[PDB]
Amino acid sequence: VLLKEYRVILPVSVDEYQVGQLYSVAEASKNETGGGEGVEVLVNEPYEKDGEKGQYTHKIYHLQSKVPTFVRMLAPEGALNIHEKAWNAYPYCRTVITNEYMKEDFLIKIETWHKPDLGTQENVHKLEPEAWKHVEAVYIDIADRSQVLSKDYKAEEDPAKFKSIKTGRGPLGPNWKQELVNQKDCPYMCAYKLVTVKFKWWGLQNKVENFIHKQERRLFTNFHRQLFCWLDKWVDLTMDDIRRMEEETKRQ
Numbered sequence: 001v002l003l004k005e006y007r008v009i010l011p012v013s014v015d016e017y018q019v020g021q022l023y024s025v026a027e028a029s030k031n032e033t034g035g036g037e038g039v040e041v042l043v044n045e046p047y048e049k050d051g052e053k054g055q056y057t058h059k060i061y062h063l064q065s066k067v068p069t070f071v072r073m074l075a076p077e078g079a080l081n082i083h084e085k086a087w088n089a090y091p092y093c094r095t096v097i098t099n100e101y102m103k104e105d106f107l108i109k110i111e112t113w114h115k116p117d118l119g120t121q122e123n124v125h126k127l128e129p130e131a132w133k134h135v136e137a138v139y140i141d142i143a144d145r146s147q148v149l150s151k152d153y154k155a156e157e158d159p160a161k162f163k164s165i166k167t168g169r170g171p172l173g174p175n176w177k178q179e180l181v182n183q184k185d186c187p188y189m190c191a192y193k194l195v196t197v198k199f200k201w202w203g204l205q206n207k208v209e210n211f212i213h214k215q216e217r218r219l220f221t222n223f224h225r226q227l228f229c230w231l232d233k234w235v236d237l238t239m240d241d242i243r244r245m246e247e248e249t250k251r252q
């Protein structure tokens, strides 16, 4: 099993990131016809354990209605049931994704620490030493065009081409992180997203784990480029605003 820590350094604050990430999930899913239908909340409850106080959820995403009929007839029982278990104690969060038919043999776990630094901490997740020694650190730089697939590139989601009206932040150049250390004002943080991918069937562990990690890097990159370029849409929201928009979207 292969573990990698993606460090996403961002020119927002931790506080800002919370709001921005919630907004961006909602907003980037706002053109998907077929979103929300088939989502099933099994559990939604508070929890508390040794400093981590938060909200736990257990949700199922039924893909039966979203795939061709022959997929839904050919799929082994439960293979189209995606389980997500989530512990949100922001600035820390853990999510575990499984497949009902794969049981625990196919697993994607993301554990994130959101810290007000430039991604300089080592083993921020406090792994056992030998285990830590086998974790690759992967830096994601949202300004760097060479980290984007050409098919994914969108000028309107390019931090190198965006300046924020409300904050004047951006556009981001290759020295933006350096000018953060030499700055006294603009906030910054780093999301330390430790991703574990497990695929125990058919001796395909290596292939699938590598494919999933590549896709996760691509998604983390595109998502946070979007998140920065939407700064003007969400930087003035509070958490209460976000909860209100959630309830609003709940009516339908």
Ligand code: NI
Pocket: 040, 060, 062
């Ligand atoms: Ni169900």
